[model samples]
Target: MSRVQLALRVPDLEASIGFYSKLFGTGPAKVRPGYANFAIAEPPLKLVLIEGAGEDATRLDHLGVEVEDSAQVGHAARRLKESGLATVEEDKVWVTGPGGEPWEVYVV
Candidate 1:
């Protein structure tokens, strides 16, 4: 089984962690000085939050929609391309999975 993944770059890791902990009703599955990760089983969602190195970085980085198979991902990529919402950096962007693990995907 697969699950959706969402990543965000924030200015303050501590603040973001606190907010998410309250919102999710649980502490982060993993945390560091500038990073935090949360795995939500109920919603089957993987969330990652990273502190911006130096720039004012309080914004959403990107999102991943996990599919049952790679075929589904390809289908979604084509649809997104047709819709003109396709991004060229699909598989090139840096992403993280559960527990702050590195991951990548191609989704238009």
Candidate 2:
């Protein structure tokens, strides 16, 4: 299933993980130094945290739509282009929204 991925740059990984664990009612699906991700099944969300922002408030890193395959990524890219948006094609497709937030339609 496709899921919306919200990546955040957090000042404290441990604290964020602890809070999100309680909030989501489950522990992180994966963890590494300075990184953690929670695959929240109920709301169909992929929450990723990256540490070392060194700020008072957590900030958005990027927004993404995690798709099932490359074909979906390509289709999204094409649709974005057809709508007059420029896309940077990698293994995934990157597009910038009007507010300048970076978004990706990707497969992981």
Candidate 3:
């Protein structure tokens, strides 16, 4: 299975961590200075928060999806190829959407 990743850059790490914990009704999977990540089972999602990306870069860092294994990563790449939406690098693959929104998948 796979889950969509929603990573955000926040000005306040602790505040973002605390606020999202309440909103998601659970604490993060991992927490460190300037960084935090949550695994949300309610909606099957991954929410990542970072204060390390620097200022004015918070609009978005990137967008991507992940699977259980790298072979699934390869599978994703092949599909992306059929759509002409991805650019392959060796056996690794990452893609950008129509508006050039950044993201990924892979195997190999």
Candidate 4:
């Protein structure tokens, strides 16, 4: 099955981490210098936060649609290429979503 992933850009990492951790009822699954991610299994939600950005982080930074199978990833890549949006990143086929975030069609 596929799940939804959200990425946020925050200005304060520690504060955001505290808020999200409380709201999600769990701590982050991964944390780095300026990035933290939470994996919620109950609702199948993946939330991520990256520091250094302003309130714009509250907006949608990117959209991810997981595929049912690995082969679907390749099929998505081919379709996106035919539509004139080719991959721009390493290890996966990349394209720009309607909102302009660079998106990748690949299995994690």
Top candidate, metric lDDT: 2
> Which regions in candidate 1 have their CA more than 4 angstroms from the true location?
54-57, 65-103, 106-108
Checking candidate 2 for backbone clashes, the offending pairs are: none
Q: Once model 1 is optimally superposed onto the true structure by TM-score, how far is the C-alpha of residue 34 displaced, in angstroms?
A: 1.1
lDDT tens per residue, model 2, 1-108: 699999999999999999999999999999999999999888999999999666788999999999999999988989999999999999599988888999988998
Q: Candidate 1's residue-wise lDDT over 1-108, tens digit each?
A: 667778898988898899988888888999888889998887787888988877485877667665565676666556655766533434333335445555445333
Per-residue lDDT of 35-93 in model 4, one digit per residue for the tens? 99898877787787878655544555565655567777777777777888756634356
Give the lDDT of residue 20 in candidate 3.
Answer: 92
Whole-model Cα lDDT of every candidate shown, in order: 0.71, 0.93, 0.74, 0.74
Global fold similarity of model 2 (TM-score): 0.94
Reference-based lDDT, residue 106, model 4: 50
C-alpha lDDT (0 to 100) for residue 75 of candidate 1: 65
Cα RMSDs, all models: 7.4, 1.0, 2.9, 2.9
Candidate 1 lDDT:
0.71
Q: Which regions of candidate 4 deviate over 4 angstroms?
A: 53-59, 66-70, 82-91
TM-score of 4: 0.73
92 Cα displacement, candidate 2 (Å): 0.8
Clashes of 4: 1
> Backbone clashes per model, in order?
0, 0, 3, 1
